[PDB]
Amino acid sequence: VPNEPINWGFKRSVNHQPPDAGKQLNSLIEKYDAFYLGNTKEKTIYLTFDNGYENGYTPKVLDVLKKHRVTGTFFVTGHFVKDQPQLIKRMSDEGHIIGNHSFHHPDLTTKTADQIQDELDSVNEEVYKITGKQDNLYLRPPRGVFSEYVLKETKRLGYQTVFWSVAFVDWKINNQKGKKYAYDHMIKQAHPGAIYLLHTVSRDNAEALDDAITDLKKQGYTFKSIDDLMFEKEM
C-alpha cells in the first residue's frame, strides 16, 4: 500500500450541515474503518481532546464535563501521561476515554511497523501503570498526518483511527483569543454527528466549553462518547 503523507483537512461545516472530506478520502478511511463523523441522522456531538502538554486548565475542563455529565475522549501523548499522572487518573476515574496520540507524537509515515507498535503500546503501558485499566484502542495520528500504510498498520494493531469534523485555533499559546472566540466556533460549526477536536491549553477554553455545552444542549443536541459512537454504529 502507498505511504504518501496525507494531512487530515476538510472544508469547514456550513449552515450546520456535516462537512465532507471528498470521495477519495471517504473511500480511504472507510477501507480501514477510520471515521471523522458519528451519526449524522440525529443531533449528537462527540467531544474529543488532544493533550500533548498541560497549561493549567485541564482540571477545569474535567470539572465542566462532570457538571454536564458528558464523556470526553482524550488523545494523550507519552509526555502528557508522564507529566500529568494525576490528570490521567481523573480521566479514568471520571468515566472518560483515554485515546492514543502516540508516545513521541512523531510523523507515523516515517516510522516502521515495529516503531509504530512501540510508539503506541508505550502510551497504553504507561496509562495502565497509572489506571490499571485500558480503553478500547483509539488513535489520532500526530498532527493529523497519515497514509494508507499508517492506516493499514495501525488497524492491524487493532487501532481505530479517529479524525474530526470540527476544530479551530485553540492551541496557539502565543495568541490566546479568549472565551468568545472558542465559544463562537463551537456554536457556529456545530452539526449532527460532529466530532469536535479541542485542546485544553488556551485561556478560558474550559469556560467556553461550559457555555457551548449549555447552549448546544438547549438547542436540542445530545453529547455522546466515541465508545457510544462505535457501539451504536454496530447495532
XYZ file of N, CA, C and O in Angstrom, residues 66-172:
428
model
N -17.905 16.955 33.993
C -18.592 16.252 35.071
C -19.919 16.951 35.360
O -20.953 16.301 35.516
N -19.875 18.279 35.428
C -21.063 19.081 35.686
C -22.175 18.787 34.678
O -23.348 18.699 35.044
N -21.797 18.641 33.412
C -22.747 18.370 32.336
C -22.928 16.877 32.085
O -23.696 16.479 31.212
N -22.220 16.067 32.865
C -22.244 14.614 32.750
C -22.011 14.174 31.304
O -22.732 13.335 30.758
N -20.990 14.762 30.694
C -20.613 14.447 29.328
C -19.303 13.671 29.359
O -18.411 13.982 30.144
N -19.198 12.655 28.508
C -17.996 11.822 28.452
C -17.073 12.256 27.321
O -17.469 12.259 26.157
N -15.843 12.617 27.668
C -14.899 13.033 26.649
C -13.899 11.942 26.316
O -13.739 10.979 27.066
N -13.245 12.079 25.167
C -12.217 11.134 24.754
C -10.969 11.995 24.615
O -10.942 12.948 23.830
N -9.956 11.682 25.418
C -8.710 12.443 25.424
C -7.571 11.660 24.793
O -7.171 10.613 25.304
N -7.061 12.165 23.675
C -5.953 11.520 22.997
C -4.682 12.106 23.594
O -4.360 13.279 23.387
N -3.965 11.282 24.356
C -2.757 11.731 25.041
C -1.440 11.235 24.451
O -1.388 10.186 23.808
N -0.382 12.012 24.665
C 0.951 11.654 24.193
C 1.739 11.114 25.374
O 1.330 11.270 26.524
N 2.875 10.487 25.087
C 3.698 9.951 26.152
C 4.063 11.020 27.169
O 3.978 10.797 28.377
N 4.457 12.194 26.686
C 4.835 13.280 27.580
C 3.720 13.685 28.534
O 3.957 13.880 29.726
N 2.510 13.834 28.005
C 1.380 14.230 28.831
C 1.141 13.222 29.949
O 0.946 13.595 31.109
N 1.148 11.942 29.593
C 0.930 10.881 30.568
C 2.003 10.898 31.655
O 1.692 10.831 32.841
N 3.261 10.997 31.247
C 4.371 11.019 32.191
C 4.379 12.293 33.041
O 4.733 12.263 34.219
N 3.982 13.414 32.449
C 3.987 14.682 33.170
C 2.756 14.930 34.042
O 2.845 15.606 35.071
N 1.616 14.370 33.647
C 0.366 14.583 34.376
C -0.381 13.319 34.815
O -1.563 13.144 34.494
N 0.283 12.440 35.582
C -0.315 11.187 36.067
C -1.664 11.366 36.774
O -2.600 10.599 36.542
N -1.758 12.371 37.638
C -2.990 12.618 38.375
C -4.165 12.940 37.453
O -5.290 12.505 37.707
N -3.911 13.693 36.387
C -4.974 14.031 35.446
C -5.440 12.784 34.702
O -6.634 12.594 34.480
N -4.493 11.937 34.317
C -4.824 10.706 33.612
C -5.728 9.869 34.504
O -6.688 9.255 34.039
N -5.406 9.852 35.793
C -6.182 9.091 36.763
C -7.600 9.663 36.850
O -8.575 8.914 36.948
N -7.718 10.990 36.811
C -9.033 11.624 36.870
C -9.869 11.244 35.657
O -11.052 10.929 35.780
N -9.254 11.288 34.481
C -9.966 10.954 33.257
C -10.550 9.558 33.397
O -11.721 9.325 33.098
N -9.726 8.629 33.870
C -10.155 7.247 34.042
C -11.241 7.091 35.107
O -12.269 6.457 34.865
N -11.019 7.665 36.285
C -11.995 7.552 37.367
C -13.312 8.269 37.092
O -14.361 7.862 37.593
N -13.267 9.328 36.289
C -14.475 10.081 35.989
C -15.217 9.622 34.733
O -16.050 10.346 34.185
N -14.902 8.408 34.289
C -15.578 7.814 33.146
C -15.204 8.244 31.743
O -15.919 7.915 30.798
N -14.102 8.968 31.585
C -13.700 9.402 30.252
C -12.885 8.321 29.553
O -12.473 7.337 30.175
N -12.684 8.499 28.250
C -11.928 7.559 27.432
C -10.557 8.154 27.120
O -10.444 9.322 26.754
N -9.516 7.348 27.289
C -8.162 7.795 27.009
C -7.740 7.192 25.674
O -7.612 5.972 25.545
N -7.566 8.059 24.678
C -7.165 7.623 23.352
C -5.659 7.742 23.214
O -5.007 8.355 24.052
N -5.109 7.177 22.145
C -3.669 7.195 21.928
C -3.214 8.252 20.922
O -3.675 8.269 19.779
N -2.307 9.132 21.347
C -1.788 10.164 20.454
C -0.295 9.917 20.199
O 0.443 10.825 19.805
N 0.121 8.671 20.427
C 1.500 8.209 20.254
C 2.392 8.756 21.355
O 2.132 9.825 21.907
N 3.454 8.024 21.665
C 4.350 8.435 22.726
C 5.142 9.705 22.454
O 5.111 10.633 23.261
N 5.846 9.746 21.326
C 6.657 10.909 20.978
C 5.996 11.842 19.972
O 6.615 12.794 19.498
N 4.736 11.564 19.651
C 3.976 12.377 18.710
C 4.755 12.627 17.412
O 4.833 13.757 16.927
N 5.336 11.565 16.826
C 6.098 11.723 15.586
C 5.214 11.580 14.352
O 4.014 11.328 14.457
N 5.825 11.754 13.182
C 5.132 11.606 11.910
C 5.163 10.100 11.676
O 6.206 9.548 11.335
N 4.030 9.433 11.871
C 3.968 7.989 11.701
C 4.368 7.478 10.326
O 4.815 6.343 10.203
N 4.211 8.300 9.292
C 4.554 7.847 7.947
C 6.055 7.646 7.785
O 6.505 7.103 6.779
N 6.825 8.071 8.780
C 8.277 7.936 8.730
C 8.782 6.815 9.641
O 9.990 6.598 9.755
N 7.854 6.112 10.287
C 8.198 5.022 11.200
C 7.877 3.644 10.624
O 6.901 3.471 9.894
N 8.699 2.662 10.973
C 8.494 1.296 10.514
C 7.395 0.662 11.362
O 6.986 1.227 12.379
N 6.926 -0.514 10.951
C 5.875 -1.209 11.689
C 6.272 -1.426 13.146
O 5.476 -1.187 14.054
N 7.505 -1.876 13.374
C 7.976 -2.109 14.738
C 7.970 -0.822 15.551
O 7.570 -0.814 16.717
N 8.417 0.268 14.935
C 8.456 1.558 15.613
C 7.056 2.044 15.965
O 6.827 2.571 17.056
N 6.125 1.863 15.036
C 4.743 2.267 15.251
C 4.157 1.486 16.428
O 3.491 2.055 17.294
N 4.413 0.182 16.459
C 3.903 -0.656 17.540
C 4.383 -0.152 18.898
O 3.615 -0.106 19.860
N 5.659 0.219 18.969
C 6.250 0.717 20.206
C 5.702 2.093 20.578
O 5.422 2.366 21.746
N 5.569 2.959 19.578
C 5.059 4.307 19.793
C 3.670 4.276 20.417
O 3.341 5.117 21.252
N 2.855 3.309 20.007
C 1.500 3.209 20.532
C 1.413 2.404 21.825
O 0.791 2.847 22.791
N 2.043 1.233 21.861
C 1.977 0.417 23.062
C 2.536 1.129 24.283
O 2.002 0.989 25.382
N 3.609 1.889 24.090
C 4.232 2.601 25.195
C 3.251 3.527 25.917
O 3.314 3.671 27.138
N 2.338 4.145 25.175
C 1.358 5.032 25.798
C 0.414 4.216 26.681
O 0.192 4.558 27.842
N -0.125 3.130 26.133
C -1.039 2.268 26.883
C -0.338 1.697 28.112
O -0.928 1.610 29.191
N 0.923 1.313 27.935
C 1.730 0.757 29.018
C 1.757 1.724 30.203
O 1.459 1.338 31.334
N 2.102 2.981 29.935
C 2.175 3.999 30.979
C 0.801 4.323 31.564
O 0.660 4.522 32.775
N -0.213 4.388 30.708
C -1.564 4.667 31.179
C -1.999 3.554 32.136
O -2.572 3.825 33.190
N -1.710 2.307 31.776
C -2.093 1.178 32.618
C -1.410 1.210 33.980
O -2.022 0.881 34.996
N -0.140 1.596 33.997
C 0.621 1.686 35.238
C -0.081 2.643 36.192
O -0.018 2.496 37.412
N -0.756 3.633 35.620
C -1.455 4.636 36.408
C -2.890 4.263 36.772
O -3.294 4.369 37.930
N -3.648 3.825 35.776
C -5.057 3.486 35.958
C -5.367 2.015 36.208
O -6.410 1.687 36.772
N -4.478 1.131 35.770
C -4.721 -0.286 35.943
C -5.820 -0.711 34.988
O -6.372 -1.806 35.100
N -6.137 0.164 34.037
C -7.181 -0.121 33.065
C -6.715 0.172 31.646
O -5.643 0.742 31.435
N -7.518 -0.241 30.675
C -7.200 0.001 29.283
C -8.465 0.074 28.440
O -9.242 -0.877 28.361
N -8.647 1.238 27.827
C -9.783 1.543 26.969
C -9.680 0.847 25.634
O -8.644 0.273 25.297
N -10.759 0.915 24.862
C -10.729 0.347 23.529
C -9.638 1.149 22.830
O -9.371 2.294 23.204
N -9.015 0.535 21.831
C -7.920 1.136 21.070
C -8.329 2.214 20.070
O -8.854 1.906 19.003
N -8.066 3.471 20.415
C -8.379 4.597 19.541
C -7.108 5.364 19.262
O -6.285 5.561 20.153
N -6.955 5.812 18.024
C -5.769 6.548 17.651
C -6.065 7.800 16.860
O -7.002 7.849 16.064
N -5.257 8.820 17.098
C -5.367 10.051 16.348
C -3.941 10.317 15.898
O -3.052 10.546 16.719
N -3.693 10.244 14.584
C -2.348 10.478 14.057
C -1.751 11.820 14.466
O -2.410 12.858 14.388
N -0.491 11.814 14.918
C 0.145 13.069 15.319
C 0.051 14.111 14.198
O 0.375 13.822 13.046
N -0.410 15.309 14.546
C -0.546 16.413 13.598
C -1.491 16.093 12.437
O -1.471 16.759 11.397
N -2.325 15.075 12.625
C -3.271 14.686 11.597
C -2.620 14.136 10.343
O -3.256 14.056 9.293
N -1.352 13.752 10.444
C -0.647 13.212 9.289
C -0.713 11.693 9.258
O -0.378 11.025 10.235
N -1.148 11.151 8.127
C -1.255 9.707 7.973
C -1.030 9.268 6.519
O -0.535 10.036 5.690
N -1.396 8.027 6.220
C -1.250 7.469 4.880
C -1.951 6.124 4.886
O -2.354 5.640 5.941
N -2.107 5.514 3.721
C -2.759 4.219 3.678
C -1.920 3.230 4.487
O -2.458 2.385 5.200
N -0.599 3.357 4.390
C 0.318 2.492 5.128
C 0.091 2.607 6.637
O 0.066 1.600 7.346
N -0.059 3.837 7.120
C -0.282 4.084 8.541
C -1.635 3.535 8.982
O -1.758 2.966 10.069
N -2.649 3.716 8.141
C -3.989 3.229 8.454
C -4.023 1.707 8.463
O -4.648 1.095 9.328
N -3.342 1.101 7.495
C -3.295 -0.348 7.388
C -2.581 -0.963 8.587
O -3.070 -1.915 9.195
N -1.421 -0.412 8.928
C -0.641 -0.915 10.050
C -1.305 -0.734 11.407
O -1.315 -1.658 12.222
N -1.845 0.456 11.655
C -2.493 0.722 12.931
C -3.730 -0.157 13.096
O -4.004 -0.640 14.192
N -4.456 -0.380 12.005
C -5.643 -1.227 12.031
C -5.220 -2.662 12.322
O -5.919 -3.401 13.017
N -4.068 -3.057 11.789
C -3.568 -4.408 12.013
C -3.263 -4.574 13.496
O -3.377 -5.670 14.042
N -2.885 -3.471 14.137
C -2.568 -3.461 15.558
C -3.823 -3.338 16.420
O -3.735 -3.230 17.645
N -4.983 -3.344 15.771
C -6.244 -3.252 16.484
C -6.711 -1.845 16.797
O -7.641 -1.657 17.583
N -6.082 -0.852 16.180
C -6.453 0.535 16.425
C -7.494 1.097 15.480
O -7.483 0.843 14.273
N -8.400 1.867 16.063
C -9.451 2.530 15.323
C -8.951 3.967 15.217
O -8.713 4.611 16.237
N -8.764 4.462 13.999
C -8.284 5.827 13.829
C -9.457 6.798 13.839
O -10.416 6.638 13.085
N -9.369 7.802 14.706
C -10.429 8.788 14.862
C -9.987 10.182 14.425
O -9.059 10.757 14.999
N -10.641 10.716 13.398
C -10.321 12.057 12.926
C -11.306 13.033 13.554
O -11.705 12.848 14.704
N -11.703 14.070 12.824
C -12.635 15.038 13.386
C -13.370 15.813 12.309
O -12.989 15.780 11.134
N -14.436 16.499 12.713
C -15.237 17.285 11.781
C -15.317 18.753 12.220
O -15.826 19.594 11.481
N -14.824 19.046 13.424
C -14.801 20.413 13.955
C -13.498 20.669 14.695
O -13.094 19.887 15.558
N -12.849 21.778 14.368
C -11.605 22.151 15.028
C -11.329 23.606 14.711
O -11.767 24.118 13.685
N -10.617 24.276 15.601
C -10.272 25.664 15.383
C -8.961 25.955 16.085
O -8.386 25.076 16.729
N -8.479 27.183 15.961
C -7.209 27.527 16.568
C -7.320 27.842 18.047
O -7.478 28.997 18.441
N -7.236 26.799 18.864
C -7.307 26.955 20.312
C -6.064 26.304 20.921
O -6.066 25.901 22.081
N -5.004 26.232 20.120
C -3.744 25.623 20.527
C -2.539 26.561 20.444
O -1.419 26.176 20.791
N -2.763 27.780 19.973
C -1.685 28.760 19.843
C -1.502 29.561 21.125
O -2.235 30.513 21.381
